[PDB]
């Protein structure tokens, strides 16, 4: 093929789109609705308009290059077409970037500025209440920002295959929303927030818990614990311009203290707890020769998927609470016993890469004696906003350490946030537990990485066992519907609803789709976690000294009695 673009001749054998070819050759073509290798098939945004001599104006994102094509990306006709589309989008867009939560990284604003577009009539609703949906415990919608680009719909389809995000005909107008325009929580939605990650503007957001947190912090009698997820320390730096793949663990501990939190712990402590309980259960099942398979239960997106699509597997889930809720449980029981705090005055806050965690924390039965395991959950993005509002110079902060009692963690706990992390961590303990040994080879590289479905054969006490790692909600559907689960007897299966694991969670920093072209965000965020594991002295959950003391002095033997009654949670199907 010979192609001419803006007077420049190219010779190529490639079969690809105008958009992809131009960008591979440093030619600028704007786009909006094209993402995840899909555009909006009905009602295309046409921001990728280019001119093909002989043909006219075409959409570059879904038009293949052809031999003999003469292309102009920046002619008068092209720019006025694009400007006109943006102008029309402004006509249905509350253009008020001041108090907008996407002010600093909005795709639409950048386009508006680039083409100097203006609305034919500014959209200024007086009563936004009919445009906003805040019913969900996890997600919120503000349709005064929505461009109807379909990016959330395609991402839901591609990441989960549930199609819980749909186009709807509402009062004769097109919107996006859940089936029947119900609250997402009341549908098959996983509350995973991949739709939010896909959104170019502030139409989709997390359900805020920031007011819960600020109120607890300012409440005189409240003692506010905070603990961040594995993934946060590998990610939040992005939002302070520190680059990608930067370990900012110590800076976070420092920032949290400056925010006024009363105790700094870590969810990775909770991860080690979950392994204590879950590895014990795995060994138990092995000894009882069943039931198999056991599934992880730490991902609330997967739990909702099981509840909504495979309720028969609910009994197969590990009874151990997630690191979040198991941590919380201990924060209202164990922690008062070593601090003298009144349990009622403890207010437990987590920082998560996840929107689904908010729903998990607000489950009615996730409490004991009237005390919630977890009182608030803020996303990585929310914590970043609190830090900036407080004018804390994050990139300049000196490192501090966590408070040790529920703050220490092993390398096993640290890798939880990557797909295959829970699996690897769990095997390191299950092998030691079952063989009554302290084995030296602890790295299970076979369950790592971005393959959608991963399997391995493991030898535990000189018997062979089959494990699988399901990487993404759509891959759980594939695993089940394809019958792959029946090709052999699986004994232990990890499921994460977000591809890449929690490092790619719905509460994570948005990433410029151009930076995404340059950076493997799932691998670079994960690399921070495996790096920590590499350099930690303790690399098994049961070698966590603060945790061992907690079990020795308070809970007793894991997976049994006191531990079972308090630290476990079983999901049940309808009769
Ligand atoms: N609870 C919990 Fe987890 C832990 O530890 C997080 O905090 Fe995850 C992360 N990062 C999230 O969100 S949940 C799914 N299991 C893997 S990691
Ligand atoms: S979504 Fe973007 S363009 Fe719209 S008000 Fe917010 S920052 Fe401005
Ligand atoms: S939260 Fe997840 S399952 Fe629900 S609509 Fe968004 S992408 Fe789909
Ligand atoms: S919510 Fe966001 S991603 Fe979905 S159609 Fe509206 S602007 Fe596009
Ligand atoms: S994979 Fe992690 S971030 Fe994604 S829904 Fe599950 S727990 Fe949340
Ligand atoms: S980016 Fe090509 S039609 Fe939207
Ligand atoms: Mg298409
Ligand atoms: Mg206070």
Numbering used by the authors: 2 to 576
Share the article's original sentences.
[FeFe]-hydrogenases represent one of natures’ most effective classes of redox enzymes catalyzing the reversible reduction of protons to dihydrogen (H2) at turnover frequencies of up to 9000 s-11–3. With their low catalytic over-potential, [FeFe]-hydrogenases represent excellent models for a regenerative and likewise economically feasible H2 production. Their active center (“H-cluster”) can be structured into a standard [4Fe-4S]-cluster ([4Fe]H) and a diiron site ([2Fe]H). Theoretical studies suggest that the most probable PT pathway comprises of strictly conserved residues E282, S319, E279, and C299 (from surface to H-cluster, numbering corresponds to CpI), including two protein-bound water molecules (Wat826, Wat1120 4XDC19, chain B) located between E279 and C29915,16,20. In this study, site-directed mutagenesis (SDM) is used to investigate the PT pathway of two [FeFe]-hydrogenases, namely CpI and HydA1, which represent the largest (M3) and smallest (M1) type of monomeric [FeFe]-hydrogenases, respectively.
Corresponding to earlier crystal structure data, for all CpI variants a space group of P1 21 1 was observed with two copies in the asymmetric unit cell (chain A and B). In wild-type enzyme S319CpI acts as H-bond donor to E282CpI and drags its carboxy group further into the PT pathway. In S319ACpI an unprecedented water molecule (Wat735) is located between E282 and A319, and the nearby water molecule Wat873 of wild-type CpI (chain B) is missing here, suggesting a translocation enabled by the unoccupied space of the missing hydroxyl group of position 319 and the slight outward shift of E282.
